């Protein structure tokens, strides 16, 4: 499918050049650069750009552009998911897809790409197999390599590749048998000026870290599965049993692993843990105005709200701000007119606020709206949906592994009008 791949930093520079079907001229990137220039923001650069002879499919991520070159008709999401997966792979091997990581591990990433994409078609795609085909760049291993002459490239196709459980390795053992589960929920919410809930839903996802020896068959069940809907499933899950038993039976892959994701139906009112009081005064053509915001707890379920951050994109009339925070930290960027308030956490003895005056451009008119509020927050030991796991069982192995699970809710797409 894919003819070639260019890694481009937001600076406009090309760092990693790949070619599978033929050598593509670097001049093709000028079409992207043009589009980048036309767009007012990297986020608004079209993911699909047609050029005279090539189609450009690209992903913006972590200050990098993954620009692939395709000369024929290929389903856009096929390509997008693939490229996205590649970036995820880089995160797996080097902590994150960053230009620094790439320039410091050029040979390695070059090799990884050669294993993952074969003549434009997906080849090595499953993490755990790839991990065995090419060993991760552990400094301890590199020492051994310099001592013994050992390779990072294996010479035996991982048995799991030809097994009926392709998502995982075979013959892997641990002395510390354990499994960790992490139930993460995100609150997607639109709050209007009055503080009324416009729209809200809950986005959940359950990840896990598997350090269990051999081939344990896990069985995950809930106390209240009726609250789950539109649940995605990783292919390793025996969907049929999910349907007939409502049980997540599967033999999981090693290490870092995303199991399922789900949505909580709108039929249940989504609790909003945070309310905002606010007032921003803009006198038309004034040299200054007023800013007042208060953050407080609402449906916090008796839990602590912490890791709270408020971000606001102010209009061009705003030049600077005279604000005093009650806690955390007030900062303002006059270049991009960005107001950032590190709130921190809420203590009921006194609710946090940020207040003072705004330095405005004299002669410039007041804005027709106040900028919406983007607010982050986290509550530990709390699944806001009320989702609770019933049982975690294991079959096929004999040991009695550490079983642990966490419940946490974080801000999702949480935005407030004003």
């Amino acid at each position: 499918m894919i003819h070639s791949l260019f890694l481009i930093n937001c600076s406009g520079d090309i760092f990693l050049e790949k070619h599978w079907k033929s050598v593509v001229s670097q001049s093709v990137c000028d079409y992207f650069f043009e589009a980048q220039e036309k767009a007012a923001d990297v986020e608004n650069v079209p993911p699909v750009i047609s050029t005279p002879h090539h189609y450009l499919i690209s992903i913006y991520r972590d200050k990098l552009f993954f620009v692939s070159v395709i000369q024929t008709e290929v389903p856009p999401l096929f390509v997008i998911e693939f490229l996205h997966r590649v970036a995820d792979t880089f995160q797996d091997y080097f902590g994150e897809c960053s230009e620094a990581a790439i320039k410091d591990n050029v040979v390695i990433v070059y090799e990884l790409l050669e294993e993952m994409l074969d003549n434009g078609f997906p080849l090595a795609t499953e993490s755990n197999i790839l991990k065995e085909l090419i060993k991760p760049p552990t400094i301890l291993r590199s020492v051994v390599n310099s001592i013994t002459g050992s390779s990072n490239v294996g010479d035996t196709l991982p048995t799991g590749q030809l097994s009926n459980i392709p998502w995982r390795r075979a013959g892997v053992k641990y002395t510390n048998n354990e499994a960790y589960f992490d139930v993460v929920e995100e609150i997607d919410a639109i709050i209007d000026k009055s503080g009324s809930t416009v729209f809200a839903e809950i986005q959940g996802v359950i990840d896990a870290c598997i350090k269990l020896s051999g081939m344990p068959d896990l069985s995950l069940s809930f106390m209240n599965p009726r609250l789950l809907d539109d649940v995605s499933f990783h292919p390793c899950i025996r969907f049929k049993r999910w349907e007939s038993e409502r049980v997540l039976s599967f033999i999981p892959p090693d290490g870092n692993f995303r199991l399922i994701s789900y949505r909580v139906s709108s039929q249940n009112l989504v609790a909003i843990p945070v309310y905002v009081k606010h007032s921003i005064s803009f006198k038309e053509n004034s040299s200054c105005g007023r800013f007042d915001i208060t953050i407080g707890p609402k449906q916090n379920m008796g839990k602590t709200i912490e890791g709270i951050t408020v971000t606001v994109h102010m209009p061009k009339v705003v030049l600077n701000m005279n604000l005093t925070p009650t806690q955390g930290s007030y900062t303002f960027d006059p270049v991009t007119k960005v107001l950032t308030w590190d709130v921190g956490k809420i203590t009921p003895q006194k609710l946090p606020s940020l207040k003072g005056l705004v330095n405005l451009q004299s002669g410039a008119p007041k804005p027709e709206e106040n900028p919406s509020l983007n607010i982050q927050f986290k509550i530990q030991q709390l699944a806001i949906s009320g989702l609770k796991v019933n049982r975690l069982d294991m079959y096929g192995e004999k040991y009695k592994p550490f079983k642990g699970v966490k419940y946490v809710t974080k801000a999702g797409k949480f935005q407030v009008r004003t």
Partner: peptide, 8 residues
């Protein structure tokens, strides 16, 4: 690493 997880 086991700290912080709910026994299950």
């Amino acid at each position: 690493s086991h700290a912080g997880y709910q026994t299950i």
